[PDB]
Write an enzyme that holds these catalytic residues in place. Sequence first.
Site, PDB file in Angstrom:
ATOM      1  N   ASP A  61       0.816  -1.220   0.000  1.00  0.00           N
ATOM      2  CA  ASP A  61       0.000   0.000   0.000  1.00  0.00           C
ATOM      3  C   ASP A  61       0.852   1.273   0.000  1.00  0.00           C
ATOM      4  O   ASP A  61       1.959   1.279   0.573  1.00  0.00           O
ATOM      5  CB  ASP A  61      -0.881  -0.037   1.235  1.00  0.00           C
ATOM      6  CG  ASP A  61      -1.889  -1.157   1.327  1.00  0.00           C
ATOM      7  OD1 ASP A  61      -2.171  -1.811   0.286  1.00  0.00           O
ATOM      8  OD2 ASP A  61      -2.398  -1.355   2.465  1.00  0.00           O
ATOM      9  N   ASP A  67      -2.274   6.767   8.491  1.00  0.00           N
ATOM     10  CA  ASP A  67      -1.671   5.473   8.860  1.00  0.00           C
ATOM     11  C   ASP A  67      -0.512   5.607   9.846  1.00  0.00           C
ATOM     12  O   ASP A  67      -0.396   4.846  10.798  1.00  0.00           O
ATOM     13  CB  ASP A  67      -1.097   4.820   7.597  1.00  0.00           C
ATOM     14  CG  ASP A  67      -2.126   4.278   6.638  1.00  0.00           C
ATOM     15  OD1 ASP A  67      -1.898   4.439   5.410  1.00  0.00           O
ATOM     16  OD2 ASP A  67      -3.159   3.689   7.058  1.00  0.00           O
ATOM     17  N   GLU A  90       0.021  -3.851  10.416  1.00  0.00           N
ATOM     18  CA  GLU A  90       0.094  -3.759   8.951  1.00  0.00           C
ATOM     19  C   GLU A  90       1.272  -2.912   8.475  1.00  0.00           C
ATOM     20  O   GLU A  90       1.883  -3.115   7.428  1.00  0.00           O
ATOM     21  CB  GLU A  90      -1.211  -3.129   8.456  1.00  0.00           C
ATOM     22  CG  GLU A  90      -1.227  -2.907   6.959  1.00  0.00           C
ATOM     23  CD  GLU A  90      -2.327  -2.004   6.441  1.00  0.00           C
ATOM     24  OE1 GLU A  90      -3.198  -1.542   7.164  1.00  0.00           O
ATOM     25  OE2 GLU A  90      -2.382  -1.635   5.226  1.00  0.00           O
ATOM     26  N   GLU A  91       1.557  -1.844   9.231  1.00  0.00           N
ATOM     27  CA  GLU A  91       2.536  -0.830   8.858  1.00  0.00           C
ATOM     28  C   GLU A  91       3.960  -1.124   9.243  1.00  0.00           C
ATOM     29  O   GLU A  91       4.834  -0.278   8.939  1.00  0.00           O
ATOM     30  CB  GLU A  91       2.079   0.503   9.492  1.00  0.00           C
ATOM     31  CG  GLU A  91       0.705   0.936   9.037  1.00  0.00           C
ATOM     32  CD  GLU A  91       0.440   0.964   7.548  1.00  0.00           C
ATOM     33  OE1 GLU A  91       1.353   1.031   6.691  1.00  0.00           O
ATOM     34  OE2 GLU A  91      -0.765   0.913   7.173  1.00  0.00           O
ATOM     35  N   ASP A 111      -4.504  -3.492  12.581  1.00  0.00           N
ATOM     36  CA  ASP A 111      -4.538  -2.646  11.403  1.00  0.00           C
ATOM     37  C   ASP A 111      -4.855  -1.279  11.971  1.00  0.00           C
ATOM     38  O   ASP A 111      -6.006  -1.057  12.411  1.00  0.00           O
ATOM     39  CB  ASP A 111      -5.621  -3.127  10.422  1.00  0.00           C
ATOM     40  CG  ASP A 111      -5.775  -2.322   9.167  1.00  0.00           C
ATOM     41  OD1 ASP A 111      -6.671  -2.755   8.362  1.00  0.00           O
ATOM     42  OD2 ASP A 111      -5.134  -1.259   8.996  1.00  0.00           O
ATOM     43  N   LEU A 113      -5.220   1.693  10.826  1.00  0.00           N
ATOM     44  CA  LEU A 113      -6.253   2.468  10.101  1.00  0.00           C
ATOM     45  C   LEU A 113      -6.692   1.635   8.926  1.00  0.00           C
ATOM     46  O   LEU A 113      -5.845   1.340   8.029  1.00  0.00           O
ATOM     47  CB  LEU A 113      -5.696   3.849   9.666  1.00  0.00           C
ATOM     48  CG  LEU A 113      -6.764   4.900   9.313  1.00  0.00           C
ATOM     49  CD1 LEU A 113      -7.670   5.149  10.530  1.00  0.00           C
ATOM     50  CD2 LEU A 113      -6.090   6.155   8.881  1.00  0.00           C
ATOM     51  N   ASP A 114      -7.921   1.202   8.907  1.00  0.00           N
ATOM     52  CA  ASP A 114      -8.423   0.341   7.824  1.00  0.00           C
ATOM     53  C   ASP A 114      -9.373   1.184   6.976  1.00  0.00           C
ATOM     54  O   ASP A 114     -10.216   1.918   7.536  1.00  0.00           O
ATOM     55  CB  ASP A 114      -9.253  -0.813   8.371  1.00  0.00           C
ATOM     56  CG  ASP A 114     -10.033  -1.608   7.332  1.00  0.00           C
ATOM     57  OD1 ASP A 114      -9.284  -2.171   6.514  1.00  0.00           O
ATOM     58  OD2 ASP A 114     -11.307  -1.666   7.335  1.00  0.00           O
ATOM     59  N   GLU A 273      -6.741  -8.316   9.705  1.00  0.00           N
ATOM     60  CA  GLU A 273      -8.004  -7.990   9.090  1.00  0.00           C
ATOM     61  C   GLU A 273      -8.918  -9.205   9.148  1.00  0.00           C
ATOM     62  O   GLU A 273      -9.988  -9.164   9.776  1.00  0.00           O
ATOM     63  CB  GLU A 273      -7.913  -7.507   7.614  1.00  0.00           C
ATOM     64  CG  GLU A 273      -7.277  -6.089   7.541  1.00  0.00           C
ATOM     65  CD  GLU A 273      -6.871  -5.658   6.151  1.00  0.00           C
ATOM     66  OE1 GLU A 273      -6.984  -4.457   5.791  1.00  0.00           O
ATOM     67  OE2 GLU A 273      -6.397  -6.512   5.365  1.00  0.00           O
TER      68      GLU A 273
END
Length: 328
Positions: A61, A67, A90-91, A111, A113-114, A273
Amino acid sequence: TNIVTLTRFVMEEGRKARGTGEMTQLLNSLCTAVKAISTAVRKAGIAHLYGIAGSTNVTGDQVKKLDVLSNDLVINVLKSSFATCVLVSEEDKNAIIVEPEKRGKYVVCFDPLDGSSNIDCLVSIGTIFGIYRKNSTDEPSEKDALQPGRNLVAAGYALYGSATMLVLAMVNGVNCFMLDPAIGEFILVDRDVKIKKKGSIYSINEGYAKEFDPAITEYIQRKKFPPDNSAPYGARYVGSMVADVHRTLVYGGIFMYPANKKSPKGKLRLLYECNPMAYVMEKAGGLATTGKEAVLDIVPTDIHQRAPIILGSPEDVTELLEIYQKHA
Ligand SMILES: O=P(O)(O)OC[C@H]1O[C@](O)(CO)[C@@H](O)[C@@H]1O
Ligand SMILES: [Mg+2]
Ligand SMILES: [Mg+2]
Ligand SMILES: [Mg+2]
């Protein structure tokens, strides 16, 4: 004058069993990060928070400014909670190992910020999390996060929508807490939530029609042209997993992010997720499947592994499973 806050609820839950109080500390800490992310999201264009951060993450992404802020907020509150030992985001390319002095018993996958693609158009976005207990005596490590979702002890999400909601699932069910913006507390508003056995809404990005497998193709056609002349299902796809799953929980129906001819494991990420949403759905009486196996039974091998996911009302998910079985 009798506020039933998330904290109170989680403290009485711990009351029952034997507890060290760590899970209440963890969730109190996470609530602080969620409130700070909600406040930033609610004034993001005035605070100049829209737009990119200047990097790409492990799963490809484009990183956004929100994020980076959300990720920092969650990592810092979890570290300071004294309840955690391994964090997967995620990051971050690798698992974060908490320093010895701040370690607690839990492993948190999140996650921060989804719904990235919906940030700048002000559509609902959210934060997703899954919590495990550490399993080994070994020095904590990335492998402590590689548990099947069936081992979750708590999971849920924050939805930054027309209101901010924290939905929390634990062993005996799902409860919804709404942020009261005037006092900064999450208040219980929906107790022991259960999904309807059958809904009337299907949720999928049909822009991928050229890539869908025959089972998804057949299922969508059935929702539009029911063979029994019942009313066709309505379609909804907000494009933020937290918003589409939350509507699926409270209205019923089905949400789909399947495998396709270009993406054999789908898009959504298993640890932060798919597994949290599968856990919420199973605790609410729904189902969550890849099309061939239960999401919560997959044993991951990569903290950023992808999985197909089909979830929601059990009669709708079963109808799609029967089509996959027919086509196998
Ligand atoms: O644009 P697409 O391919 O439908 O992807 C939307 C999905 O991607 C995500 O943004 C990934 O976080 C989800 O929130 C959402 O369900
Ligand atoms: Mg992303
Ligand atoms: Mg996401
Ligand atoms: Mg994200």
